[PDB]
Amino acid sequence: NDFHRDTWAEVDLDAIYDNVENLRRLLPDDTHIMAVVKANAYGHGDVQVARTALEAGASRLAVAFLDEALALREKGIEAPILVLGASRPADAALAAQQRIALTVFRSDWLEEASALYSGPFPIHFHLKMDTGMGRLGVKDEEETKRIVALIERHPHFVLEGLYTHFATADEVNTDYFSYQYTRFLHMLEWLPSRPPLVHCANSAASLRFPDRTFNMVRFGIAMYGLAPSPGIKPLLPYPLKEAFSLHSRLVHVKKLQPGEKVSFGATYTAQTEEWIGTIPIGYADGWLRRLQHFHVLVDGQKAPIVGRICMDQCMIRLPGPLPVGTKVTLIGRQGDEVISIDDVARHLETINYEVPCTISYRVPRIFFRHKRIMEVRNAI
Amino acid sequence: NDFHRDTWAEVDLDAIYDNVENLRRLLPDDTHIMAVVKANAYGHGDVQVARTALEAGASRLAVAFLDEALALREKGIEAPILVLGASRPADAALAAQQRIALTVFRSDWLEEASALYSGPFPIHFHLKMDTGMGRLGVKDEEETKRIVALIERHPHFVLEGLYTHFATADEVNTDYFSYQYTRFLHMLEWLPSRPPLVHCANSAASLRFPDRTFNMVRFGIAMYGLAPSPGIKPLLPYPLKEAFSLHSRLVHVKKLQPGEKVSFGATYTAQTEEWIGTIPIGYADGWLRRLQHFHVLVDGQKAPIVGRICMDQCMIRLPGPLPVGTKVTLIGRQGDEVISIDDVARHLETINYEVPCTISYRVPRIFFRHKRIMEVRNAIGR
Numbered sequence: 044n045d046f047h048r049d050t051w052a053e054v055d056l057d058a059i060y061d062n063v064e065n066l067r068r069l070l071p072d073d074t075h076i077m078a079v080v081k082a083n084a085y086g087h088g089d090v091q092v093a094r095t096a097l098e099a100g101a102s103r104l105a106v107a108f109l110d111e112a113l114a115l116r117e118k119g120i121e122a123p124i125l126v127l128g129a130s131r132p133a134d135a136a137l138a139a140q141q142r143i144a145l146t147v148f149r150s151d152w153l154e155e156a157s158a159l160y161s162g163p164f165p166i167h168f169h170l171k172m173d174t175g176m177g178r179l180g181v182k183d184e185e186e187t188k189r190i191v192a193l194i195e196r197h198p199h200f201v202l203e204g205l206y207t208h209f210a211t212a213d214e215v216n217t218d219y220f221s222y223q224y225t226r227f228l229h230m231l232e233w234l235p236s237r238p239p240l241v242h243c244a245n246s247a248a249s250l251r252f253p254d255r256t257f258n259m260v261r262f263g264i265a266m267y268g269l270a271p272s273p274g275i276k277p278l279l280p281y282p283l284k285e286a287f288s289l290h291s292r293l294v295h296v297k298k299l300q301p302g303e304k305v306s307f308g309a310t311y312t313a314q315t316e317e318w319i320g321t322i323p324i325g326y327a328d329g330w331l332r333r334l335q336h337f338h339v340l341v342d343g344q345k346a347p348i349v350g351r352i353c354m355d356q357c358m359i360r361l362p363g364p365l366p367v368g369t370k371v372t373l374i375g376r377q378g379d380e381v382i383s384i385d386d387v388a389r390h391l392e393t394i395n396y397e398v399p400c401t402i403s404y405r406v407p408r409i410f411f412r413h414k415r416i417m418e419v420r421n422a423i
Numbered sequence: 424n425d426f427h428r429d430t431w432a433e434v435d436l437d438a439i440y441d442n443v444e445n446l447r448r449l450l451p452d453d454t455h456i457m458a459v460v461k462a463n464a465y466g467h468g469d470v471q472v473a474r475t476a477l478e479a480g481a482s483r484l485a486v487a488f489l490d491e492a493l494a495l496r497e498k499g500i501e502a503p504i505l506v507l508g509a510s511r512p513a514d515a516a517l518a519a520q521q522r523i524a525l526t527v528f529r530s531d532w533l534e535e536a537s538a539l540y541s542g543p544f545p546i547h548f549h550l551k552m553d554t555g556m557g558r559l560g561v562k563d564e565e566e567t568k569r570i571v572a573l574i575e576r577h578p579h580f581v582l583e584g585l586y587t588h589f590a591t592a593d594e595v596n597t598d599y600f601s602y603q604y605t606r607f608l609h610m611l612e613w614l615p616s617r618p619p620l621v622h623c624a625n626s627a628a629s630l631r632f633p634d635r636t637f638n639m640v641r642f643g644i645a646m647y648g649l650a651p652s653p654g655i656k657p658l659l660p661y662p663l664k665e666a667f668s669l670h671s672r673l674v675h676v677k678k679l680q681p682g683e684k685v686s687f688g689a690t691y692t693a694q695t696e697e698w699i700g701t702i703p704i705g706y707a708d709g710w711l712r713r714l715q716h717f718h719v720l721v722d723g724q725k726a727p728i729v730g731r732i733c734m735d736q737c738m739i740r741l742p743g744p745l746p747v748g749t750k751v752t753l754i755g756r757q758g759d760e761v762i763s764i765d766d767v768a769r770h771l772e773t774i775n776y777e778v779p780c781t782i783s784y785r786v787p788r789i790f791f792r793h794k795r796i797m798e799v800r801n802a803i804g805r
């Protein structure tokens with residue numbers, strides 16, 4: 044995959060491999076690892092992250108919705124996949140034909156599905172229980188039993204597992220968390236039989252209490268080397284390795300005279316003669332306008348962004364007359380300077396999770412494995 | 424093309440067509456229209472909008488960088504395409520064989536290109552002049568004349584046009600706009616001869632001053648039916664037709680008891696008995712966390728978002744019990760209620776341009792033409 048604009052993201056698969064390996068070491072032998080690769084693996088590349096996680100010790104994969112599971116299958120991934128979110132009862136046959144497990148939490152879903160499907164492939168279901176997140180999941184014992192009854196009755200429906208999700212596993216105070224964990228145990232008792240796969244921990248929960256992860260953990264944010272939250276960082280059992288970095292190059296360089304304005308709205312005025320560099324990245328690439336007033340790295344030095352950020356372009360104040368082609372790092376390291384995704388999330392007034400997901404389809408991803416470029420992916 | 428999540432965007436190509444067709448009649452008959460379709464047509468679908476615009480009167484297309492132009496050609500587009508942004512002189516040949524025009528703003532670029540290219544396909548260039556935007560473009564007479572001469576010299580280089588871009592055309596006050604217009608006229612005199620295509624007008628400039636557009640306009644934002652700025656809405660010569668809308672469906676419905684928490688951080692807590700719906704759209708789809716105090720349309724009414732927006736979903740307070748599958752409109756109209764891209768932009772404290780561009784690859788685009796679904800585009804579909 045080649046691309047023709049000097050803007051790209053770099054995904055170090057070694058960082059992903061290591062984050063997964065360290066979790067494997069930490070976790071009891073009986074706890075499996077399910078790599079969470081939804082949203083194109085949090086913007087890092089679904090297949091690339093998936094195959095690497097499987098190498099490091101993960102045996103299963105998780106995605107947000109059916110299409111994401113189908114995209115993995117089409118790309119050659121044959122490992123087990125679980126859709127964490129909702130799906131259509133009408134798509135049960137497709138999921139089954141494609142060996143994709145589905146999350147379920149309503150009895151009417153199963154009834155609708157039973158009327159529309161009768162074989163020949165079995166469908167593996169993971170019952171979602173709401174223990175406090177208030178997102179998806181069954182909440183009454185009567186419903187739980189009805190759902191189980193419908194699955195056991197259908198000759199092609201299988202209850203592979205059951206789970207819940209924690210809403211505050213990344214907060215120092217563990218009051219609500221403990222509440223959710225306790226409620227989960229009580230609800231499990233509603234099941235006539237304990238499914239082979241019981242899981243509940245995400246990155247925060249698994250890393251903090253690896254001994255209360257039952258038989259499978261759903262490793263997400265930490266696999267990409269990003270902390271679940273600022274407050275949990277000083278609690279992480281091992282150093283996370285950031286895998287995502289973002290770069291570009293100066294495509295234009297010019298010296299402005301005092302009084303000259305830059306970008307839309309002419310919001311910036313050069314107070315003194317200075318050199319301005321233009322880079323080929325804008326908000327259509329996920330470098331949102333809110334990043335105005337932020338600093339990028341060039342020649343190992345911080346260079347503030349000047350004026351408003353454009354759809355495809357960006358202007359910065361250079362320390363001096365630098366040549367076109369000079370490497371600009373928006374996320375990553377240059378010399379003794381470093382910009383993390385947390386720094387970017389901070390300025391964007393959001394959390395690390397959102398940043399890589401927002402770097403759009405337009406930005407090619409270059410993959411590094413064993414310190415060598417292994418593959419390049421340009422969505423267009 | 425199919426998709427398997429109840430979340431999608433609809434692009435009304437009839438609206439696209441009408442916005443461009445109206446511009447066709449507003450402008451002088453000899454003025455060409457270049458449809459700007461960079462960023463996958465501002466998130467509406469590059470080839471679908473490009474093809475539609477050409478039917479409506481547009482004769483040329485514009486993109487941000489080379490990859491977007493090659494994409495259009497791969498998709499069957501044959502009309503002229505100009506790359507507005509920078510490019511690698513090493514890629515000159517490829518662009519030439521693909522009949523893609525390139526923007527140029529410095530002589531050393533031509534030096535490098537000339538050293539690596541010697542035919543057979545001609546490369547058409549559009550010289551960029553910076554008239555106050557401070558992005559790209561030459562700024563002195565010397566450099567200008569040098570670019571022209573280097574183009575003249577090379578047997579396969581051709582100066583097709585010259586242009587500039589306005590930084591404040593969508594502002595009521597026209598002081599800076601006037602300065603830029605006047606500077607552009609001054610800079611045009613630096614050229615030994617006028618290239619066939621002189622241009623400067625974007626949506627705002629073209630719509631407000633159609634008789635000040637030279638021989639070609641670059642129609643962007645208004646083609647999608649979006650006002651260049653809320654400020655000039657009353658100055659619009661003709662009503663724009665909003666092309667983009669975003670929808671979803673409830674995938675779960677439940678009645679919470681007072682005291683129960685919702686979403687990450689246990690941020691929200693129900694005070695009394697209420698109904699909560701869950702929809703399959705989150706920030707990985709472009710529905711940013713920043714929208715947590717915003718709302719959506721359901722059952723023909725405004726339904727506030729509750730708690731924090733997750734990566735793939737969010738919760739909303741329902742007016743009461745509703746069936747799973749009930750349609751939810753994030754951007755569009757339901758009965759006598761409506762949420763526009765401008766509404767989303769205002770809440771997010773950003774401009775309308777950014778909103779559709781942010782609705783990610785993950786969201787399928789359903790295309791309508793002549794009031795019927797024409798095609799579906801699912802970026803991750805089989």
Ligand SMILES: Cc1ncc(COP(=O)(O)O)c(CNc2conc2O)c1O
Nearest residue numbers: 079127208245246261262263264733734
């Ligand atoms: C059901 C489920 N399990 C595990 C994970 C992994 O969580 P982690 O990246 O903190 O390790 C997620 C993603 N959780 C989400 C984070 O933001 N929105 C989400 O849905 C999830 O939805």
Ligand SMILES: Cc1ncc(COP(=O)(O)O)c(CNc2conc2O)c1O
Nearest residue numbers: 353354459507588625626641642643644
């Ligand atoms: C050179 C050029 N011409 C024409 C247009 C169309 O502008 P319009 O959508 O206001 O009609 C743009 C896009 N203008 C941009 C808007 O944000 N960043 C941009 O580069 C552009 O960059």
